[PDB]
Symmetry: C2
Subunit: 130 residues, 2 copies
């Protein structure tokens, strides 16, 4: 079962990573948009300050997301190594894995929501100035 | 607007580096959990260390990216035109590649250390 647990660990880590990558892509596109708002507008340092603030907020929230899902993954890994030595069933391992996998997608959903709110606020505030 | 696409590409470059680190770490978790079949403490420590170094690398990358974006955003509206913009972009790419390389090496070292000591 330890082999199976290993596969499970790699998969959880990769799911976390993929969440991080999708979030990062969204943030990239956001950066592009904000810069286009810079170009299509009057010359104002203010818009630059706002863009920088937005990008920094997005980075901070991204780091918090990664931290959360990483904590989850390492805990699931330890929990798996524990289980494959306390009483390795099969469906108990499958269950630990499926539960962690549940929490990962829930965490990632909440993350995408926070991100989205940040972006919307940013875009809007950049609209209102200039 | 060229600078906008540039911003996106730099950001995506950073993200790709991060993704490579994460994949390496997944593989590392698998191997380390194979060496278990205590050792649990070694594995936990190694994984947490890999995560910490990942976060350090991502932080450095992010600062590079945002600095480059602010520089671009000022360059446009200050003028300077295509060659100067391209130069800002390519220099940012260069420094990003350097950072990504040293980060990649440090990560590789951590993983190899970890495996080697779960062997001992």
């Amino acid at each position: 079962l330890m082999e199976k647990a290993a596969r499970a660990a790699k998969e959880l880590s990769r799911e976390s990573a993929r969440a991080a990558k999708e979030l990062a892509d969204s943030n990239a596109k956001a950066a592009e948009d904000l810069m286009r708002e810079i170009a299509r507008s009057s010359s104002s340092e203010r818009l630059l300050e706002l863009m920088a603030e937005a990008i920094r907020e997005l980075q901070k929230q991204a780091a918090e997301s990664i931290a959360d899902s990483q904590r989850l993954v390492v805990e699931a890994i330890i929990r798996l190594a524990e289980a494959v030595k306390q009483g390795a069933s099969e469906k108990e391992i499958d269950e630990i894995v499926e539960e962690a996998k549940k929490r990962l997608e829930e965490l990632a959903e909440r993350s995408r929501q926070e991100n989205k709110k940040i972006i919307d606020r940013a875009k809007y505030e950049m609209d209102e100035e200039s």
